[PDB]
């Protein structure tokens, strides 16, 4: 009869629509994750920049410490020799 | 074939649309999990990078402090000579 069939056909359309709604939701979550990733990536680039800059500054000051330390020693020596 | 053959071809068809949509829903769920796992990975990356940045900045501050102390000490010596 046209009942059992029409109802089954309707159940099949319904089931498809539900799967489509599930895909829609997952897709929405995918894009939220992707946009967070983009923010994290920018954050990383920036913190990497800060790291390189800090490393190079650290090196400069370390080298300046040695020179100062040396100059101090030479000042003590010279005073003592005077 | 006018008859149930034609109406059976439809049923099959609707079964297909359903199967395809289910398939696509599964694949969408898989891409979502993948995108989120990429995010977690970058979070791990930033946690690690920040640890390295905190160490380097603390090290740099410690050397800089030491340097300022040494510099002041030397300057004293020099101002003393300059003033004599």
From Swiss-Prot, chain A:
Residues 13-39 have a biased composition (Basic and acidic residues). Residues 2-39 are annotated as: Disordered. It comes from the Eukaryota. It is found in: Cytoplasm, Cytoskeleton. The modification N-acetylmethionine is found at residue 2. Homodimer. Heterodimer of an alpha (TPM1, TPM3 or TPM4) and a beta (TPM2) chain. Interacts with HRG (via the HRR domain); the interaction contributes to the antiangiogenic properties of the histidine/proline-rich region (HRR) of HRG. Belongs to the tropomyosin family. The molecule is in a coiled coil structure that is formed by 2 polypeptide chains. The sequence exhibits a prominent seven-residues periodicity. Binds to actin filaments in muscle and non-muscle cells. Plays a central role, in association with the troponin complex, in the calcium dependent regulation of vertebrate striated muscle contraction. Smooth muscle contraction is regulated by interaction with caldesmon. In non-muscle cells is implicated in stabilizing cytoskeleton actin filaments. This is Tropomyosin alpha-1 chain. It comes from Gallus gallus. The lineage of its organism: Eukaryota, Metazoa, Chordata, Craniata, Vertebrata. The chain holds residues 1 to 54 of 284 of the full protein.
């Amino acid at each position: 009869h046209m009942d059992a069939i029409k109802k089954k056909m309707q159940m099949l359309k319904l089931d498809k629509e539900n799967a489509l709604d599930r895909a829609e939701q997952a897709e929405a979550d995918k894009k939220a994750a992707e946009e967070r990733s983009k923010q994290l990536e920018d954050d990383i680039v920036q913190l990497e920049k800060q790291l390189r800059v800090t490393e190079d500054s650290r090196d400069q000051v370390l080298e300046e410490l040695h020179k100062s330390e040396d100059s101090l020693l030479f000042a003590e020596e010279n005073a003592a020799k005077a």
